[PDB]
Amino acid sequence: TVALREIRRYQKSTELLIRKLPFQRLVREICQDFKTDLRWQSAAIGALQEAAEAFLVALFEDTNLCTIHAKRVTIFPKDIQLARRIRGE
Amino acid sequence: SRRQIQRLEQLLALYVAEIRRLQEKELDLSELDDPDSAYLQEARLKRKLIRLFGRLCELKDCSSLTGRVIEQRIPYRGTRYPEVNRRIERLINKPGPDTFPDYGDVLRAVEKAAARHSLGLPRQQLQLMAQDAFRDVGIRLQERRHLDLIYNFGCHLTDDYGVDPALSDPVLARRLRENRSLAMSRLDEVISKYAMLQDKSEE
Amino acid sequence: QGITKPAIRRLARRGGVKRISGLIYEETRGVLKVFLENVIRDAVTYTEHAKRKTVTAMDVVYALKRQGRTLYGF
C-alpha cells in the first residue's frame, strides 16, 4: 500500500511549469560548458528542476512584494534587481 | 467494489516501484539529449499514477485530496475590521494555482470593503492598511509555497539519510565557499546586465 | 531550442506578477541558466570530491542548501 506522502511528491512533480526535455537539455548544455563527463541520477535532474522553478518563482514573488504602486504595473529588469537587493540572499 | 479498489492499490504500488527504479537510473550526457530518457519516462509514470489515484478515490467515494499544505485555507485576521479581513481572505483563497495577488489587488480590496461599510477611513490609513496586509499575505503565500517545496522534495534516495561531508573536510569547504563567491557574482552579473540593457534602451 | 515564453509568463504569474516587459523573457532564461550553473558546480564538486562517477540526488541536495533560502528547513 502506497502512503499519501509518496502520492504528494509525485503530484508535485506533475505540476512543474517548465517542459522536462528542454530542462534536461539545458542541464546537458551546462555540463558540456563545464567540461564534466559525469553521469546523473534521474532523481538529481528532478531535484534540479523543482529547485530551479522554485528559485524563479521566489524571484518574481520578491519583485511583487517590493512593488508598491497599485496602478496596473509592468515588471522590468530594474524591478527584479531592486527586489533582489532588498529581499535577496 | 472491494476487489476493484484492492486491485487499483496494487497498481499504484507497481507504478511506485517502477518510478523508484527509474529514479536510480544513471544518465550520461547522450541520454540527457534523449526525449525518451529515464527522466521523461519517469514523468510519464508519475502522470499515470496520479490519474490512477483519482480513479481510486472515485471508487471509494472519498475526496481526491492528497493533503497538500497548499490546499489549506489561509486565514486573514489582520485588522480591526472583519469586512476588510474577509475580503482579504477571499482574495488570497481564490481557486487555482495563480491566486497570488499584487499590491493593487490588496489596496482595491481594502478600498471596496471600506466604502461598502462606510468605515470613514482616510486614504493614508487605508494605504498603510493595504501595505501591511499585502506584506503579511505575500510573505505567508511565499512561505506556504516553500513549505510545499521542502515537504515534497526528493525521493526514496533522499529518504535514506545525513551530515554534509564539507563539515569534516576543510578543503572541500574552501572549494564550496569559492564556488559561493562565484555564484553570487554571476547572479549579480546577469541581473545587472539586464538592468543596464533596460537603462540603455531608455536613454 | 530553449525554455518557452508562456512558461516564463506562468512562472511570473505564480509569484503574483501579471505583467512583464520584453527583456524579462531573456533575463529569466539567463537567470535560470546561471542558477543551474551554480547548483551543478557545487554538486559536481561534491561528486568529484567523493571520487564518484555519478552525481546523486544527495549531491544536488547538499548543493542546493548552499544556494540560500531555497532548501532552508529541509
Quick tags:
A: mainly alpha, 3% strand, C: 74 residues, mainly alpha, Histone, subunit A, 3 helices, elongated, nucleosome core (chain C)
Entry summary:
The complex is a heterotrimer of chains A (89), B (203) and C (74). Chain A is mainly alpha-helical and 89 residues long.
Describe this entry's structure for a reader.
The complex is a heterotrimer of chains A (89), B (203) and C (74). With 89 residues, chain A is mainly alpha-helical. Chain A has four helices and one strand. The longest helix of chain A is centred in the middle third of the chain and has 25 residues. Chain A starts with a helix and ends with a helix. With 203 residues, chain B is mainly alpha-helical. Chain B has one domain: Methane Monooxygenase Hydroxylase, Chain G, domain 1, CATH 1.20.58. Chain C has one domain: Histone, subunit A, CATH 1.10.20. In chain C, helix 2 packs across helix 3. The chains are: A mainly alpha (89), B mainly alpha (203), C mainly alpha (74). At the A-B interface, helix 1, helix 2, strand 1, helix 3 and helix 4 of A face helix 1, strand 1, helix 2, helix 4 and helix 5 of B. Chain B: Belongs to the DAXX family. Chain B: This is Death domain-associated protein 6.
- What's the number of extended β-strand segments of chain A? 1
From the alpha-carbon coordinates, what is the Rg of chain C to the nearest angstrom? 15 Å
The most extensive contact between chains is: A-B, 52 and 64 residues
Strand and helix order of chain C: HHEH
How many independent structural domains of chain A?
1
Query: CATH homologous superfamily of chain A?
Result: Histone, subunit A
The shape of chain C, in one word, is: elongated
* Count of all domains of chain C: 1
* Structural class based on helices, strands and sheet pairing of chain A: mainly alpha
Q: What is the succession of H and E elements of chain A? A: HHEHH
Quickly give the structural class of chain C: mainly alpha
CATH class of chain A: Mainly Alpha
Largest pleated sheet of chain C: none
Report the CATH C-level class of chain C. Answer: Mainly Alpha
Beta-strand level of the residues of chain C, as a percent range? under 5%
Radius of gyration of chain A: 17 Å
* CATH level 4 superfamily of chain C: Histone, subunit A
Coiled coil (chain B): 1-34, 173-203
Main location (chain B): cytoplasm
Subcellular location (chain B): Cytoplasm; Nucleus, Nucleoplasm; Nucleus, PML body; Nucleus, Nucleolus
Modified residues (Phosphoserine) (chain B): 30
